[PDB]
Design a protein around this ligand. Sequence first.
Ligand SMILES: *C(=O)N1C[C@H](NOS(=O)(=O)O)CC[C@H]1C#N
Length: 268
Amino acid sequence: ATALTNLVAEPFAKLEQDFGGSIGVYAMDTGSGATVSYRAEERFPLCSSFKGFLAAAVLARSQQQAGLLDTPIRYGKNALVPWSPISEKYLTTGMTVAELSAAAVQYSDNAAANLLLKELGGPAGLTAFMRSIGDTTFRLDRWELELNSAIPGDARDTSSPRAVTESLQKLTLGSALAAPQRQQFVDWLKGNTTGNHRIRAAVPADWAVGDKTGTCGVYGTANDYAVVWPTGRAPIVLAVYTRAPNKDDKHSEAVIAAAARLALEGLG
Ligand SMILES: *C(=O)N1C[C@H](NOS(=O)(=O)O)CC[C@H]1C#N
């Protein structure tokens, strides 16, 4: 007999009703193949969470372009947009592609993301990379900060929790990238500074976590995806996305952490 997905799903329904919006979850146990799924194929805005996949796309390019990560990008003052706390420090020198990638992943630096998008051929270039690994759901259409608008019913700049989780697994644990690039992606995710109150909050402190967050700032729209390495066990890959119908509906980190906990506890 197969899983009773109604019983798996029930607690997510209760959680999203108090939240006043929709919660989307996909979790994959790479040990057993067990999954947890709730609204996992619905679209949610990516917000800043696209930046993890952007760094993966840069790493893929570096396999064809030797030394790409070492390349200085010497940007002007009009690169600087709000929530660019790392790139704003280095206007007088520029930053390397590697530094920009780390900043985009770990501080969610907006200018760094825009500069890296320009290097990859814009939002279309990132989307094309995702298509190359079999992700047909992901789409990035716009740049920072317009991509954060999160308008209900807008398909631009969205993916699904399932697609995010599947692509994350391919890139961090599968061999979609060469081993050095794969480990670099993992290390950038592990050094994230913005995720302590989201999936990380549901995970025992002695287990390694790599994640990337997103917070659109409107429409109760925020998210996190992660790889979790339980000690002596196969890793877990998961994504938690939220949205809500009114522009002034609050996002909630606690709701993301709670959904992450329900997903993690429900596996296998
Ligand atoms: C991305 O969604 N961002 C970047 C900045 N940080 O938030 S995050 O949750 O760490 O990604 C502020 C919110 C928004 C923008 N712009």
